[PDB]
Amino acid sequence: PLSK
Amino acid sequence: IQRTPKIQVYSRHPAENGKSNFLNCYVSGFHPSDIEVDLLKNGERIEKVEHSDLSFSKDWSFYLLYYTEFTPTEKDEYACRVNHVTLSQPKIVKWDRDM
Amino acid sequence: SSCSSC
Amino acid sequence: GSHSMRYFYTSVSRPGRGEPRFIAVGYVDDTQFVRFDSDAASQRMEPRAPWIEQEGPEYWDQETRNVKAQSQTDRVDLGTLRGYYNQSEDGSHTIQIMYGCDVGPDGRFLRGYRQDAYDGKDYIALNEDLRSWTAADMAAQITKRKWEAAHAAEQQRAYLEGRCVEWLRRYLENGKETLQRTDPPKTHMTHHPISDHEATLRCWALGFYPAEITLTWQRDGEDQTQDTELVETRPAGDGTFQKWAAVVVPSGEEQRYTCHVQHEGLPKPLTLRW
């Protein structure tokens, strides 16, 4: 995280 | 979306033949970041050239400074050769001492 | 100092 | 006056040539102070200004951890965005991230930024309120929704309003001799006949810091903006910058043209006339  | 480099070729200080100086080639406004920049003395690639760490502007376009210590003479011609995907052949830009 | 939690 | 701290991250995929390359650089105002290059041998965040070298090993370990974690995140994101835009596995792509904060003369937080690109174009950006996001297109809307759900904005604001500013203040104090200096431009004119009836006048600004500067040409007091050749402000390589502006003048009319130089380092704007 914070993944796209 | 590719963008071709702007290229300036110049010395750190106003050139004086026989006085040590730095030859710069500044490339900017380009995308993608993959690029090759060579400094040429009388058409021959100078071996020892360093460059700044990759960064980019507000518009996302990349910029790099390539540079080498040198001592200009009246005989020696200098140029910056830039190789980038937007250019079907390498662009060679000659050093003019008043640009 | 860079961000750790980004 | 005001000051900024900015981090710039670039990740580039290189299919079937292993891992993406990741480069980070950090700046305070126009001065670079750290870098990281995933391909270099050290695998460490490194110093690039003198004043940062006083940070101890805990600093460098943490900074190194940060950037290595961002590179792994970008690695996965490069695959995700390729999927969102239905792109082949074969092409190279680029994710870029710029973030940072601005402080005023008194050191107080003015503003915070975090903005992301995909292939050199806006992807997603934290709005000035630091609570909401702007998505450029439908792919970035997917990200935006994930980021809203994960409360991403709250994490980033806390960094931008806290550590970002605190460290910028630290660096401004510890590097005060260079970061808080102004180097006024050293100016001169050059002049080259083009024919018997035209000549170039070129106005030079050298050795200046910070990069921001204004060079203008006037004829009889009238701005010649539309007839002025400017070059992009450029690095000298020693931490100062250079710029020039030129006009083509009908030969013999040089005394009518004045070059005007504005810079934070000058007690007053300079005028030059050939």
Residue with tokens 């980021």: D147
Residues D176 and D186 in one domain: no
- As a whole number of angstroms, the distance between CA D131 and CA D28 comes to 25
Report which residue type is found at D93: H
Let me know: does D152 contact D127? Beta carbons within 8 Å. Answer: no
- As a whole number of angstroms, the distance between CA D29 and CA B19 comes to 32
- Please report, to the nearest 10 degrees, the dihedral formed by the alpha carbons of residues D102, D103, D105, D107 taken in order: -160
Q: Which of D133, D158, D181 lies at the terminal end of a domain, its last residue?
A: D181
> What is the total count of domains within chain D?
2
> What is the total count of domains within chain B?
1
Residues D212 and D264 in one domain: yes
- As a whole number of angstroms, the distance between CA D151 and CA D147 comes to 6
State the nearest Cα–Cα gap between C2 and chain D, in angstroms: 6
The helix (run of H) or strand (run of E) holding residue D12 is: strand D3-12
Map residue D212 onto helix, strand or coil: coil
Provide, for chain C, the percentages of residues in helix, strand and coil under a 3-state DSSP scheme, each rounded to the nearest 5. 0, 0, 100
Residue range(s) defining the domain that contains residue D198:
182-274
Burial D45-57 (b: 16+ CB within 10 A, else e): bbebbebbeebee
The DSSP 8-state label assigned to residue D52 in this structure reads G
* Sequence-ordered list of residues with C-beta below 8 angstroms from that of D18, at least 6 positions apart, any chain: none
Let me know: does B67 contact B26? Beta carbons within 8 Å. Answer: no
- As a whole number of angstroms, the distance between CA D259 and CA D274 comes to 9
Per the annotation, does D84 bind a ligand?
yes
Per the annotation, does D27 bind a ligand?
no
Q: Which of D152, D181, D210 lies at the terminal end of a domain, its last residue?
A: D181
Let me know: does D48 contact D42? Beta carbons within 8 Å. Answer: no
Residues D93 and D155 in one domain: yes
For residue D187, the cross-strand partners are D205
Residue B60: count of CB within 10 angstroms of its CB: 23
User: Chain C, 1-6: which have a CB under 8 Å from a chain D CB?
Assistant: 1-6
- Chains near A with 3+ CB pairs less than 8 A apart are D
User: Hey, what are D130's tokens?
Assistant: 């630091």
For residue D248, the cross-strand partners are D200
CATH number at residue D273: 2.60.40.10
Map residue D211 onto helix, strand or coil: coil
Residues D201 and D79 in one domain: no
Method underlying the structure: X-ray
- As a whole number of angstroms, the distance between CA D223 and CA B77 comes to 37
Let me know: does D217 contact D258? Beta carbons within 8 Å. Answer: yes
Count of residues making up chain C: 6
Per the annotation, does D113 bind a ligand?
no
Residues D177 and D191 in one domain: no
Residue B41: count of CB within 10 angstroms of its CB: 15
The DSSP 8-state label assigned to residue D195 in this structure reads S
For residue D234, the cross-strand partners are D242
Provide, for chain B, the percentages of residues in helix, strand and coil under a 3-state DSSP scheme, each rounded to the nearest 5. 0, 50, 50
Q: Is D89 exposed, middle or buried (0-12, 13-18, 19+ CB in 10 A)?
A: exposed
CATH number at residue B28: 2.60.40.10
Resolution of the PDB structure in angstroms:
1.9
Residues D161 and D192 in one domain: no
- As a whole number of angstroms, the distance between CA D183 and CA D270 comes to 14
Residues D267 and D208 in one domain: yes
Size of interface B-D (CB pairs under 8 A): 72
Q: Which of D154, D181, D208 lies at the terminal end of a domain, its last residue?
A: D181
* Sequence-ordered list of residues with C-beta below 8 angstroms from that of B47, at least 6 positions apart, any chain: none
Comparing alpha-carbon positions, the chain D residue that sits nearest to C4 is: D66
